[PDB]
Automatic annotation (TrEMBL), chain A:
UniProt keyword terms in alphabetical order: Membrane, Photosynthesis, Photosystem I, Thylakoid, Transmembrane, Transmembrane helix
GO biological process: one example: photosynthesis
Record has Chloroplast as a keyword: no
Species whose genome carries this gene: Chroococcidiopsis thermalis (strain PCC 7203)
Top-rank taxon, per record: Bacteria
Gene (UniProt): psaM
Membrane topology recorded in Swiss-Prot or TrEMBL: Single-pass membrane protein
CC annotations in GO: photosystem I; plasma membrane-derived thylakoid membrane
Subcellular location: Cellular thylakoid membrane
Designated name of the protein: Photosystem I reaction center subunit XII
Family in the record: Belongs to the PsaM family.
UniProtKB/TrEMBL annotation, chain H:
Subunit: The PsaA/B heterodimer binds the P700 chlorophyll special pair and subsequent electron acceptors. PSI consists of a core antenna complex that captures photons, and an electron transfer chain that converts photonic excitation into a charge separation. The cyanobacterial PSI reaction center is composed of one copy each of PsaA,B,C,D,E,F,I,J,K,L,M and X, and forms trimeric complexes.
Residues involved in chlorophyll a 7 binding: 26
Full-protein residues shown: 67 to 131 of 782
Binding-site residues for chlorophyll a 6, renumbered to this chain: 19
Protein name: Photosystem I P700 chlorophyll a apoprotein A1
Location in or out of the cell: Cellular thylakoid membrane; Endomembrane system
Binding site for chlorophyll a 4: 9, 12
Automatic annotation (TrEMBL), chain I:
Gene Ontology, cellular component aspect: photosystem I reaction center; plasma membrane-derived thylakoid membrane
Function, in words: Participates in efficiency of electron transfer from plastocyanin to P700 (or cytochrome c553 in algae and cyanobacteria). This plastocyanin-docking protein contributes to the specific association of plastocyanin to PSI.
Keyword Transmembrane: yes
Pfam families: PSI_PsaF
Subcellular location: Cellular thylakoid membrane
Protein name: Photosystem I reaction center subunit III
Spans traversing the lipid bilayer: 59-77
Higher taxonomy: Bacteria, Bacillati, Cyanobacteriota, Cyanophyceae, Chroococcidiopsidales
UniProtKB/TrEMBL annotation, chain J:
Function text: Stabilizes the interaction between PsaC and the PSI core, assists the docking of the ferredoxin to PSI and interacts with ferredoxin-NADP oxidoreductase.
Family in the record: Belongs to the PsaE family.
Organism in which the protein naturally occurs: Chroococcidiopsis thermalis (strain PCC 7203)
Keywords, comma-separated and alphabetical: Membrane, Photosynthesis, Photosystem I, Thylakoid
Protein name as annotated: Photosystem I reaction center subunit IV
Membrane topology classification: Peripheral membrane protein
Gene responsible for this protein: psaE
Length: 31, 29, 739, 80, 42, 139, 46, 65, 137, 65
């Protein structure tokens, strides 16, 4: 039994935080 | 020059190789 | 000028397309950036390392999430020997119904890829059982990547930017990385094995909800503090134990049984736990060697600069001058990177060599395609890491080495007898190549003329003797571990040879990869491997030692690591830079790893066929390799799609061609050189300028790729084609032919 | 632009100036050699980097050296 | 049936929308953004 | 403005491009004793007239090659000059710089980019790390 | 004729002569003693 | 130059004549030409015969006739 | 002692190979020699092991013969090159072989091992490191 | 050194570093590199002569007579 719709959506929402932090780190390194 | 350190290290390594060969040729066990 | 690249005004003022290309090729060469200081360099590197760690964690999280979402982990648990693991689902909206049907397999109702990375076996061995656990791990790794990204951002803020002295403090870093990064991590992994992995392998569920009040051993922690450690080794798993069940399951948490678990044909989990406990203890002990803040401990600079051996006068360790080296390594990031890359390459080679012969994961030894893919993957990575180690050694020679601070030490002596070093490497390479190729073609001619008995077939007696000394009784030698009465086998003073029974059982097993039987073909291919290693080392060492200069170019150090040439004068100086030596050595590294992986794959294919005699009788001449390995095993790969239909190998069939395409493309970049293309581009520029209705116009003047850029692009195409072609062939010939 | 340097080993043989296809070099008075002249590169902005001057230089090692640097329209030899 | 792409996994419409988005919808705007970034005058 | 009559030429594809009108252009002027056939720098044959001739070119190398390898070497013409013309009409006579050919030593010419040492005494790059100076530019 | 003799001492001519002589020697050894192998040289025919 | 061209062309013609003579001689002395003429459809043409020194005589294919 | 290798005359696969052979100059006597003198593996083909105290002459004889021949060639070349150095035009003597000099060099190199030992003892074999052209470090 | 003397080159970047050359002439003026040395072997540019200063040479043999 694989994960459900809610788990996929929760993973997608959680992955936003590393994405934003990666953008912040990239812009800081570009400085 | 006799090269003391070089020849001592070389002889130690050669003695190790000879001992391995002697084990390998069933001279010693 | 343009804003891009921000780090180079010379490139920013370039009015041609080259400005873009070089901007990508020099972005991570922080030392050459405009207005770069050492402290800023170290801080930027530290933040970039945080970013790379975050990327690695995101990659692991993605693998876990895709397995938990579209894989068949739970179904694969119930039958690891007959269920194909699923990597991820396929969504290619331009498939036909035959392709959809062909790729719908492994119990799925949608097209899927078959996983060959072995992550299913790895997760199964370490106690993972449900898709929910994989999902939780993926979420945790997402959070960890976010944490490391935040740390990378934070340590760039003015109050948290470390000083140069913090980066230069070698002794505390060594202490912390030996005791904490290596030792404490190993102890934590042993704790995970004892508390989670072993109980799960014994059919008992242990998780975050109950691990606090579920002791891993009945004796508890009292046995450890009292000194009754032997209680942890009592009642191991029986030879009839069934993995992931309590049938035949023991209670010991730290044994030293040795050999393999009889059912899974892989290393005992308790043995691995005790291994990691011992490694943790050893590394924690090692992490207390150097002096940081309390007086006690060795000072590396003092050891390198020492000139007295208990009163006697010596030039240094082994009577060799090592003085001034502490500042040389400490101030040269390229030197440290060279050791780091060399160590990682050796470790990757060791991983490849020790994982197929001693599988650590349950049933992974019976997944032939997974074994082949893992071995080839880690060996090629090791080759790349070695090439990088020597390339950055050359970069150190050019950029960071200064003769006066290294006067008289061993590095200076190496630079001073570089000629002897290179000449002797060339001699070894010539001898190996001449005699190996001559014996190969002699055997080829004899077999072609119906005289296979006239082949020169040199027995690998030394390696066979080593195998016998390790316990292989097949060859008839009666030395060391193959002699039950030997001093080594009995271990007369203590008889603590608790490894010998299981180790001998694994060694003398005829159905595993532990010290495979070897003959003349193995001898010849090992000497070919030695030739490849020596030639690649010759190229890399000649590039590194001649990086500062040679008779042809006495002032090479003033031109940098990577430059095209020094013109057609003085006879011509094409490919004279050390970068060009690394470029040339990549070809030889690819050739050597091709030989190594060909040997491994053909031997294991013969073993898995039940046709070992084919390899034994055909590997002694090169036509045997050409016919019985490549031509014979390419049939299923090239029949993945044909005028009669398609099957699951179609992708490999296509990719096999794709690699062959990329390889071909590289030749165009490697044979044809710049001026031809520059003149052609000039003609095309005229054509565009004189054509009506073509309102477009270049903002960057189109020019042909530079000489060094062309070499790099050709090498990239060559390597990509090499890897893609061999990977497609490997997967198709192993998977389409076996389970 | 590229950088052209002249070292004190120059013998004033004028070969590098004659070999230059873009008139980067010229002979200037000097006292360090018998020929009483030395090469100079006042117009390195026009240097293409062909290294014909290095080929023409007879001294060992070279008395004139070309170091390729930032690329401009004229240093790339572009007619467009 | 095996005449179309389907998915037995949760939210099988997700590949249905994301493959076009990542591979032939967003890439051209991303290339345009990069082109604007690398061609900006100082 | 520059005086002189253009050589007889029926046209070709090796002439000027957008760079001539946008960035810069070059003009080579000379005087010949008679009308005679020469080779254009970018292919083709042209006829130089008896009076003073003026030729428009895209690169300075074209003018240098035409003046040296053809005008002096073959036609024994030594009065050729090369000017750089900018789009705004500003013109500078760039060859020869001071009215004397560069290969002939002339008084008043300063030493430019001269290094007061042999090439083997350049410092190692490890000396000048983060200092921004190249070994050949080191004092 | 002395020029012909000097020509006969050229490196290519001497190399060709030496290679031809060595090839003839090896060919005659193959014809007279076919099948010679390591562990068999200078041993009587059984 | 032209005289050199003429003499060298005569030399190359001599080389071609030597090659043609070799082909004809090998077809006259070391071939199965007569047997092939007897049975054109059942005999493989052959005009090169190898010596027997190192097992290369296996290259002497049974060409018929 | 190695047991996987047995004399070829006692190997059934080698016997099958012997019977199935063509009857030509190239097979009969070679097979008789291989059966009498060679050791065969499980595949029936002769194998050459370096793990036997016996038949050590079978290893040392070809090795010594090749070493002697190679040293002879090398010593002839070295002596000829050293003899041509004293000439005014050594390159002309390297594109034109000086027959008396080559014959003398060959005759002397007939005894190359003793000459090499004598040169090594007297320091004539090698040139010192400071009289050899080298590149800058 | 003087004309006819044999010298060993000490210039590190020279093709003839630690090699042997023959002095052809010495310039008596105050030029930087007055000694002219010829060599038996050519360098990579085909040149077999060069100019050196006195401190870049080591005399190994006096001129004949
Ligand atoms: C921009 C604009 C422009 C324009 C307009 O405007 C143009 C135009 C022309 C005319 C005139 C002619 C004819 C056409 C044809 O046929 O071919 C092409 C095709 C196509 C398709 C091209 C393309 C077109 C355009 C680009 C379109 C675009 C659109 C898209 C869609 C966009 C997209 C965007 C997104 C974001 C991605 C041509 C050509 C040529 N090209 Mg050329 N272009 C250009 C661009 C470009 C670039 C980038 C490059 C690099 C890759 C090149 C390249 C080339 C070569 C090699 C050649 C040849 O050979 C040809 C000729 O010369 O002949 C004679 N070139 N061109
Ligand atoms: C290195 C690698 C290698 C090696 C090593 O070792 C070898 C060896 C072998 C042996 C074992 C035998 C014999 C030995 C004798 O002869 O013995 C007598 C002599 C004496 C004892 C002694 C002699 C001495 C001498 C005379 C001295 C001189 C030498 C010279 C210097 C050389 C050089 C010269 C020139 C070449 C001209 C043989 C033989 C064969 N082969 Mg074999 N090799 C090889 C190579 C090769 C290649 C590439 C190819 C292709 C071409 C081939 C081919 C062939 C054929 C067909 C046949 C044959 O029938 C043979 C027989 O039977 O088998 C069994 N293979 N081989
Ligand atoms: C116990 C304390 C501790 C621990 C666990 C670490 C851990 C780490 N440090 Mg570290 N460090 C420490 C103390 C510690 N440090 C101290 C005290 C200093 C100052 C002297 C530093 C200064 C420092 C620098 C300057 C850098 C690190 C970096 C790193 C990371 C290396 C990348 C990686 O994942 O390695 C792999 C981890 C493994 C366990 C693999 C080992 C397996 C091998 C191959 C087999 C043997 C790693 C996470 C690097 C970084 O930026 O990372 C973010 C880096 O550049 N450290
Ligand atoms: C032929 C050599 C070879 C082989 C057989 C493998 C085998 C493997 N690698 Mg691998 N790898 C190699 C060389 C190789 N590696 C090299 C040289 C690099 C450095 C670039 C990598 C970098 C690498 C990464 C980063 C990852 C793997 C992973 C894997 C595993 C899953 C992928 C797979 O099915 O195989 C590979 C099958 C192939 C046919 C290889 C060719 C694939 C493409 C077509 C190559 C061209 C790339 C691209 C198209 C060109 C640029 C765009 C598998 C064990 C994955 C893993 O760990 O699994 C979780 C993973 O994430 N590898
Ligand atoms: C931890 C490993 C590590 C680290 C930190 C570095 C770091 C560095 N290397 Mg190095 N290197 C390594 C491993 C490493 N290398 C290995 C394993 C090799 C052997 C292949 C090399 C070979 C090498 C050479 C030959 C050179 C460097 C150079 C450099 C420096 C500048 C990087 C550069 O050119 O800009 C960034 C460069 C790139 C981004 C390259 C573009 C990508 C290439 C072409 C791969 C093609 C992409 C491929 C299709 C897919 C890859 C995955 C994709 C996601 C990109 C920098 C200090 C250069 C230097 O110092 O100049 C003096 C230099 O000349 N390295
Ligand atoms: C099949 C391809 C091939 C082969 C055989 C070689 C062979 C060789 N390479 Mg090489 N190389 C190749 C491809 C190849 N390369 C490619 C594609 C690259 C990337 C550009 C390189 C890059 C490279 C580098 C960078 C280096 C080499 C080196 C070497 C030599 C070391 C091995 C040796 O001495 O063995 C013994 C020699 C051989 C096997 C060569 C064949 C000898 C023949 C068979 C003898 C036949 C004699 C016969 C009478 C001739 C017939 C007459 C004829 C003249 C008409 C050797 C000559 C290294 C070197 O020179 O070290 C000394 C070195 O530094 N190569
Ligand atoms: C690096 C890890 C990684 C990798 C290589 C992949 C690979 C893939 N994913 Mg995926 N995915 C991941 C992590 C990863 N996933 C995570 C963590 C999630 C949960 C948020 C998802 C959720 C997800 C969905 C919902 C779908 C895919 C799909 C796919 C496939 C098509 C690509 C696509 O549409 O992307 C879609 C990707 C996302 C929606 C989010 C990706 C988030 C990751 C963490 C970004 C990683 C960035 C990377 C590290 C930076 C690269 C740097 C550069 C220098 C290389 C492809 C096999 C599709 C599929 O199954 O097709 C059949 C699909 O519909 N993924
Ligand atoms: C292109 C010219 C050519 C070529 C390639 C050959 C090639 C050959 N000839 Mg041949 N030959 C030629 C012209 C040529 N011949 C001419 C013009 C004549 C007439 C004088 C001969 C007369 C001749 C004889 C008499 C013999 C050969 C033989 C041979 C073979 C071995 C030659 C040898 O050992 O040396 C070889 C296939 C020998 C042969 O085939 O043995 C069976 C042999 O006995 N040739
Ligand atoms: C006078 C003959 C002679 C001698 C004594 C040596 C001696 C040596 N060579 Mg050498 N060499 C020679 C000729 C010779 N070479 C020629 C002609 C070539 C061009 C093909 C080379 C190419 C060469 C390379 C590329 C290398 C050596 C190396 C070496 C050293 C160890 C390996 C070896 O023995 O070479 C093995 C032999 C060869 C590789 C080929 C030589 C075979 C030729 C064809 C024989 C010529 C004989 C000559 C014509 C006799 C004429 C004399 C007559 C007038 C009386 C050693 C100092 C190696 C080294 O530096 O080791 C540290 C190395 O890497 N040599
Ligand atoms: C027992 C044996 C073995 C082994 C061996 C070994 C291991 C050896 C070693 C060896 C070594 C470890 C050596 C070393 C050396 C060194 C050196 C250093 C050398 C030198 C040389 C020289 C110098 C030479 C010279 C010459 C001559 C004499 C002649 C010719 C010419 C010339 C000049 C070349 C084997 C198995 C194989 C086989 C069987 C037997
Ligand atoms: S730099 Fe060289 S070519 Fe130019 S004048 Fe000096 S010695 Fe002559």
């Amino acid at each position: 039994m694989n994960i459900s719709d809610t788990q996929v959506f929760v993973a997608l929402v959680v992955a936003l935080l590393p994405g934003l932090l990666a953008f912040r780190l990239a812009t800081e390194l570009y400085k | 020059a006799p090269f003391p350190f070089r020849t001592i290290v070389s002889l130690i390594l050669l003695a190790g190789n000879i001992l391995v060969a002697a084990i390998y040729f069933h001279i010693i066990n | 000028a343009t804003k891009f690249p921000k780090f180079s005004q010379d490139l920013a003022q370039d009015p041609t397309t080259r400005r873009i290309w070089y901007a990508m090729a020099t972005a991570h060469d922080f030392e050459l950036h405009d207005g770069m200081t050492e402290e800023n360099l170290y801080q930027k590197i530290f933040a970039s390392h945080f970013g790379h760690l975050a990327i690695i964690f995101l990659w692991a999280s993605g693998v876990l999430f895709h397995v938990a979402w579209q894989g068949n982990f739970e179904q694969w648990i119930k039958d690891p020997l007959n269920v194909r693991p699923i990597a991820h689902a396929i969504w290619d909206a331009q498939f036909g119904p035959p392709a959809i049907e062909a790729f719908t397999r492994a119990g799925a109702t949608n097209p899927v890829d078959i996983c060959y990375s072995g992550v299913y076996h790895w997760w199964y061995t370490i106690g993972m059982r449900t898709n929910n656990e994989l999902y939780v791990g993926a979420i945790f790794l997402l959070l960890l990547a976010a944490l490391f990204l935040f740390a990378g951002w934070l340590h760039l803020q003015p109050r948290y930017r470390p000083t140069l002295g913090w980066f230069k403090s070698a002794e505390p870093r060594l202490n912390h990385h030996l005791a904490g990064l290596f030792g404490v991590s190993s102890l934590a992994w042993a704790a995970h094995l004892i508390h989670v992995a072993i109980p799960e392998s014994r059919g008992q569920h242990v998780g975050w909800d109950n691990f606090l009040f579920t002791p891993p051993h009945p004796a508890g922690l009292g046995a450890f503090f009292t000194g009754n450690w032997s209680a942890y080794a009592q009642n191991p798993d029986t030879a009839q134990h069934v993995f992931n069940s309590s049938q035949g399951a023991g209670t010991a948490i730290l044994t030293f049984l040795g050999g393999f678990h009889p059912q899974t044909q892989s290393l005992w989990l308790t043995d691995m736990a005790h291994h990691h406990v011992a490694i943790a203890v050893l590394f924690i002990i090692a992490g207390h060697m150097y002096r940081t803040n309390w007086g006690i401990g060795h000072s590396i600079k003092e050891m390198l600069n020492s000139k007295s051996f208990f009163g006697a006068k010596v030039e240094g360790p082994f009577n060799l001058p090592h003085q001034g080296l502490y500042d040389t390594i400490n101030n040269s990031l390229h030197f440290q990177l060279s050791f780091a890359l060399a160590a990682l390459g050796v470790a990757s080679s060791l991983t490849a060599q020790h994982m197929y012969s001693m599988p650590p994961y349950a049933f992974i030894g019976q997944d032939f395609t997974t074994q082949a893919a893992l071995y080839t993957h880690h060996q090629y990575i090791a080759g790349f890491l070695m090439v990088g180690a020597f390339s950055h050694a050359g970069i150190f020679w050019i950029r960071d080495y200064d003769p006066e601070q290294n006067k008289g030490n061993v590095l200076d002596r190496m630079l001073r007898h570089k000629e002897a070093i290179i000449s002797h490497l060339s001699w070894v390479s010539l001898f190996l190549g001449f005699h190996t190729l001559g014996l190969y073609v002699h055997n080829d001619v004899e077999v072609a003329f119906g005289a296979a008995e006239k082949q020169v077939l040199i027995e690998p007696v030394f390696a066979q003797f080593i195998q016998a000394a390790h316990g292989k009784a097949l060859y008839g030698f009666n030395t060391l571990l193959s002699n039950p009465d030997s001093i080594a086998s009995t271990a007369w003073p203590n008889h603590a040879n608790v490894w010998l029974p299981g180790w001998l059982d694994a060694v003398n097993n005829t159905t595993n990869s532990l010290f495979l039987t070897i003959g003349p073909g193995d001898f010849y291919v090992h000497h070919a491997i030695a030739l490849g290693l020596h030639v690649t080392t010759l190229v890399l060492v000649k590039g590194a030692l001649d990086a500062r200069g040679s008779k042809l170019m006495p002032d090479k150090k003033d031109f940098g690591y990577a430059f095209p040439c020094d013109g057609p004068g003085r006879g011509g100086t094409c490919d004279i830079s050390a970068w060009d030596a690394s470029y040339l050595a990549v070809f030889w590294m690819l050739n050597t790893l091709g030989w190594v992986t060909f040997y491994w794959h053909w031997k294991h294919l013969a073993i898995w066929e039940g046709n070992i005699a084919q390899f034994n009788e055909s590997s002694t001449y090169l036509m045997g390799w050409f016919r019985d390995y490549l031509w014979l095993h390419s049939a299923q790969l090239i029949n993945g799609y044909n005028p009669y239909g398609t099957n699951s190998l179609a992708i490999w069939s296509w990719m096999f061609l794709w690699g062959h395409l990329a390889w071909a493309v590289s030749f165009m970049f490697l044979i044809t050189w710049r001026g031809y293309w520059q003149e052609l581009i000039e003609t095309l520029v005229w054509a565009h300028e004189k054509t009506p209705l073509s309102f477009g116009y270049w903002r960057d003047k189109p020019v042909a790729l530079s000489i060094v850029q062309a070499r790099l692009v050709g090498l990239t195409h060559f390597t990509v084609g090499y890897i893609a072609t061999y990977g497609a062939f490997l997967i198709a010939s192993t998977a389409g032919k076996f389970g | 632009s590229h950088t052209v340097k002249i070292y004190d080993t120059c013998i004033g043989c004028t070969q590098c100036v004659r070999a230059c296809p873009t008139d980067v070099l010229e002979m200037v008075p000097w006292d360090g050699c018998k020929a009483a002249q030395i090469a100079s590169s006042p117009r390195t902005e026009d240097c293409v980097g062909c290294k014909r001057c290095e080929t023409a230089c007879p001294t060992d090692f070279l008395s004139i050296r070309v170091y390729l640097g930032a690329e401009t329209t004229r240093s790339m030899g572009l007619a467009y | 049936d095996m005449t179309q792409l389907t998915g037995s996994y949760a939210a099988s419409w997700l590949p249905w929308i994301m493959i076009p988005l990542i591979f032939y919808i967003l890439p051209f705007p991303v290339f345009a953004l990069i082109f604007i970034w690398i061609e900006k005058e100082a | 403005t520059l005086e002189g009559q253009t050589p007889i030429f029926g046209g070709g594809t090796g002439g000027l491009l957008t760079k001539a009108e946008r960035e810069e252009k070059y003009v080579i002027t000379w005087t010949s004793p008679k009308e005679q056939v020469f080779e254009m720098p970018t292919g083709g044959s042209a006829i130089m007239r008896q009076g003073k001739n003026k030729l428009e070119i895209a690169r300075k190398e074209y003018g240098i090659a035409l003046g040296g390898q053809q005008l002096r070497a073959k036609f024994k013409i030594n009065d050729y000059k090369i000017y750089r013309v900018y789009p705004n009409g500003e013109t500078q006579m760039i060859h020869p710089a001071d009215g004397v050919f560069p290969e002939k030593v002339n008084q008043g010419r300063p030493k430019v980019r001269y290094v007061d040492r042999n090439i083997g005494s350049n410092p190692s790059p490890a000396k000048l790390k983060f200092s921004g100076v190249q070994p050949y530019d080191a004092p | 004729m002395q020029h012909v003799f000097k020509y006969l001492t050229l490196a290519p001519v001497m190399a060709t002569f030496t290679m031809v002589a060595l090839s003839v020697v090896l060919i005659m050894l193959q014809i007279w003693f076919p099948g010679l192998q390591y562990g068999t040289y200078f041993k009587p025919t059984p | 130059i032209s005289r050199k061209i003429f003499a060298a062309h005569f030399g190359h013609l001599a080389v071609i004549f030597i090659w043609l003579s070799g082909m004809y001689f090998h077809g006259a002395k070391f071939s199965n030409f007569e047997a092939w003429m007897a049975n054109p459809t059942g005999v493989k043409p052959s005009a090169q015969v190898v010596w027997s020194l190192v097992g290369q005589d296996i290259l002497n294919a049974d060409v018929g006739g | 002692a190695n047991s996987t290798l047995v004399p070829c005359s006692k190997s059934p696969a080698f016997q099958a190979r012997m019977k199935n052979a063509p009857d030509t100059y190239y097979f009969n006597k070679p097979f008789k020699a291989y059966a009498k003198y060679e050791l065969c593996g499980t595949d029936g083909l002769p194998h050459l092991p370096l793990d036997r105290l016996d038949r050590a002459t079978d290893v040392l004889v070809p090795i010594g013969l090749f070493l002697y021949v190679a040293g002879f060639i090398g010593w002839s070349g070295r002596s000829y090159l050293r003899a041509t150095k004293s000439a005014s035009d050594p390159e002309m003597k390297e594109i034109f072989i000086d027959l008396p000099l080559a014959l003398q060099s060959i005759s002397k190199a007939v005894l190359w091992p003793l000459l090499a030992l004598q040169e090594f003892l007297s320091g004539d074999l090698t040139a010192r490191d400071e009289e050899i052209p080298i590149s800058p470090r | 050194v003087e004309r006819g003397s044999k010298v060993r080159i000490l210039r590190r970047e020279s093709y003839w570093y630690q090699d042997v050359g023959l002095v052809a002439s010495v310039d008596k003026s105050g030029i930087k590199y007055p000694v002219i040395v010829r060599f038996d072997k050519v360098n990579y540019a085909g040149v077999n002569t060069n100019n050196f200063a006195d401190f870049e040479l080591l005399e190994i043999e006096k001129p004949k007579a």
